[PDB]
Design a protein around this ligand. Sequence first.
Ligand SMILES: Nc1nc2c([nH]c(=O)n2[C@H]2C[C@H](O)[C@@H](COP(=O)(O)O)O2)c(=O)[nH]1
Length: 154
Amino acid sequence: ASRLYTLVLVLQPQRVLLGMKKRGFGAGRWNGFGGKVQEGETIEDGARRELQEESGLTVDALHKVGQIVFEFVGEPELMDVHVFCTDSIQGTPVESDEMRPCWFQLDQIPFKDMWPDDSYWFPLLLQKKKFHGYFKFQGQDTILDYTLREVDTV
Ligand SMILES: Nc1nc2c([nH]c(=O)n2[C@H]2C[C@H](O)[C@@H](COP(=O)(O)O)O2)c(=O)[nH]1
């Protein structure tokens, strides 16, 4: 068993929107926006909800671009992260309790202050290739195992 999560990247031709996570899981790493999917909503609806809660933004269309499954050693549930992109945002991003948003140039992505797995799959997002990844972590810094491939259907 696994628990559904979302992750949303606003990727525009020369920049990508990240938020500095201010509290909770992943605090202190830049990331896309997202969270747990709730009972009674779709995954994509949960992705939009979280985008709105964390940034104020709404979007016309979200595209599925990837899936990443995480194992954390000693934790029973795998995390099944559904990754979306958009270039179609509505509004200007604002800081929330969870996130402080900033735009980054595509060659200035702050990998050293991101989850360590992002170094591996982010390039494929940027290159517009759909992927499936799997990372096993010991704590929040150490990747013990991983797999990564491109896919045609996410
Ligand atoms: N880029 C990236 N996002 C992750 C990783 N692990 C992980 O749960 N997430 C995402 C999914 C969700 O958007 C978010 C976790 O949910 P909360 O912020 O609600 O705790 O972090 C990771 O290793 N890298």
